[PDB]
Write a protein that binds this ligand. Sequence first.
Ligand SMILES: CNc1nc2c(ncn2[C@@H]2O[C@H](COC(=O)NCCc3c[nH]c4ccccc34)[C@@H](O)[C@H]2O)c2nccn12
Lengths: 115, 112
Amino acid sequence: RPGGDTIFGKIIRKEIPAKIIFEDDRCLAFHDISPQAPTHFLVIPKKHISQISVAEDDDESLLGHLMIVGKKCAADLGLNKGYRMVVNEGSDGGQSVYHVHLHVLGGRQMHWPPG
Amino acid sequence: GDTIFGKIIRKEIPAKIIFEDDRCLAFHDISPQAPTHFLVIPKKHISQISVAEDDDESLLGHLMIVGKKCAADLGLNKGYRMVVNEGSDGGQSVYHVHLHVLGGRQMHWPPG
Ligand SMILES: CNc1nc2c(ncn2[C@@H]2O[C@H](COC(=O)NCCc3c[nH]c4ccccc34)[C@@H](O)[C@H]2O)c2nccn12
């Protein structure tokens, strides 16, 4: 089972349904089930990486691709006033699924601090 | 147009530098929102993530690898949050791409 057996691995393999925005060989973008803004989606690698703190050096281009995909999808969804991208690491970061994921939130004014 | 982050890269104004290489700089935020709050920025002037080029994808990933290495070196073993802001809704404060890294406290949800 490529993708791992976190819930996000199951979404990658189409075992659990999701509302998918974009898909390529490297990643998947899909809407969050508990949105915290009018638009709130995730971009994840298809390669299982548990958390950013254990990402390999040669995962650099993949991580960058999540961001590029994130910004493209935000444009395609009409987030013309802007958005916030978030990666959570570990307990203090609020990480709830141990498969790396980029949150993209928009459609309202985001506030400071970012939690 | 130039920004304060350009001035920091050029060493024209002071910042507490954590790490530097040929293509990025990491430094503590002047307005920290957590006990540890630093930025990782490219030396290339990309004004905002929305205008990043495809060719920039490994540079962007390099910011996050540098960020996670710096976080480890700064002792953030209980975790942290990485943030990129875009535009007015995103609360982007400087029009030079920057990755925020915050930790040393529980970060909350929603992330603003
Ligand atoms: C999209 N579909 C989907 N999404 C899920 C599910 N189960 C969790 N997800 C989504 O994945 C994100 C993981 O976030 C974090 O790991 N940190 C974000 C902050 C956070 C999440 N949980 C916390 C708990 C405490 C503190 C902070 C957090 C969340 O925004 C969830 O809504 C799920 N099952 C079946 C289908 N599911």
